[PDB]
Design a protein around this ligand. Structure first.
Ligand SMILES: O=C(CCCCCCC(=O)Nc1ccccc1)NO
Ligand SMILES: [Zn+2]
Length: 372
């Protein structure tokens, strides 16, 4: 049983435009980081491969895929593509990330899956692009690696696939994709749609359609969410799943945006709570395929995913970051959103302190209605 990390420094060449949250290095940055912390070896890394047209078609429609391919190389927005495919906008602009990086991130999810099925443990930090629809770009996403991955498994015969999304936002793409089926159970904790993207979906009431009614569970959570609240809903919502679904396999997306320092989230979570959310899912359902997801703060991103890597890699977490790592992080131009909050403290340790607190009624009500 090997523990593999799927990645490449090439993502770093497929960034989104300056004015875009995804303009920064992310997975390429994770690799440089753990290499600087000496927490990864060559024999544990798997080079990302591009998803084949066929694999993408296990979910996405040809016209939508050909539109992506055409738009990228001509580096343009084709006539009627903006409207029909939600491509070209600020949200999902034209770039080399729209198809080449997306395909790369997607092939890595299948790679991650192939590995798991070989009896190994893999983590694909570039995957977890859960917003894309069958024929539409959405929320920075063009290709839905999770859906594509899940369909991959269905073709391999699995009939009870589980998907847990701990990313701060609802995986509306993953939801629409298996909303009418009961072979795939979709579960998601995220910022309530009442105040956060997607805004149009993610509400507790969305429990399915047809045979799938009861196989989609959304856990809308309040702003200022603290560690205890987060963990509370996880353990609690996982329970609802176990009494209703016996998984043959499950995927977990681990976006680091729920963390306190990430601006695209109103949650004030910590690394440790994040790490624990992870281990709790593993305690309940065993090992599964681990995916990446949203994350916009270079420091949180790096420290957080490094914890996941250590946990998997069975290696102790250095309590501090050596100089090579501190310098790396400081070399990235990110520009803090809130002028000066000062996040240099993140450079003084890998595991930050707990940010627990009481558990608001809201959360307990949310869970209770989800239970009922
Ligand atoms: O990370 C996500 C959500 C992506 C959608 C975020 C869109 C909102 C947006 O445009 N925000 C923004 C843009 C520039 C600078 C800061 C925030 N999925 O989990
Ligand atoms: Zn997110």
């Amino acid at each position: 049983k090997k523990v593999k990390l799927i990645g490449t420094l090439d993502y770093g060449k497929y960034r989104y435009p300056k004015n875009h949250p995804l303009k920064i290095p992310r997975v390429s940055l994770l690799l440089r980081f753990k290499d600087a912390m000496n927490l990864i070896d060559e024999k544990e890394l798997i080079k990302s491969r591009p998803a084949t047209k066929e694999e993408l078609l296990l979910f996405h429609t040809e016209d939508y895929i050909n539109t992506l391919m055409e738009a990228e190389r001509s580096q343009s927005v084709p006539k009627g593509a903006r409207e029909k495919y939600n491509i070209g906008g600020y949200e999902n602009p034209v770039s080399y990330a729209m198809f080449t990086g997306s395909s790369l991130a997607t092939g890595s999810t299948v790679q991650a899956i192939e590995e798991f099925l070989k009896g190994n443990v893999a983590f694909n930090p570039a995957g977890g692009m859960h917003h894309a629809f069958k024929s539409r770009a959405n929320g920075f996403c063009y290709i839905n690696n999770p859906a594509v991955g899940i369909e991959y498994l269905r073709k391999k015969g699995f009939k009870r696939i589980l998907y847990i999304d701990l990313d701060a936002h609802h995986c509306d793409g993953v939801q629409e994709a298996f909303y009418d089926t009961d072979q795939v159970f979709v579960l998601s904790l995220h910022q309530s749609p009442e105040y956060a993207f997607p805004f149009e979906k993610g509400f507790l009431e969305e429990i399915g359609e047809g045979k799938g009614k009861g196989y989609n569970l959304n856990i809308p959570l309040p702003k200022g969410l603290n560690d205890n609240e987060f963990l509370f809903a996880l353990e609690k919502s996982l329970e609802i799943v176990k009494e209703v679904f016996e998984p043959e396999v499950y995927l977990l997306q681990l976006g680091t945006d729920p963390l306190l320092e990430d601006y695209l989230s109103k949650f004030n979570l910590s690394n440790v709570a994040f790490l624990k959310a992870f281990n709790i899912v593993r305690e309940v359902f065993g090992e599964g395929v681990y995916l990446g997801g949203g994350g916009y703060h270079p420091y949180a991103l790096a420290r957080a995913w490094t914890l996941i890597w250590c946990e998997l890699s069975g290696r102790e977490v250095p309590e501090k970051l050596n100089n090579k790592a501190k310098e790396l992080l400081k070399s990235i131009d990110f520009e803090e959103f809130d002028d000066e909050v000062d996040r240099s403290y993140m450079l003084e340790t890998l595991k930050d302190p707990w940010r627990g607190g009481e558990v608001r009624k809201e959360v307990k009500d949310t869970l209770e209605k989800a239970k009922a």
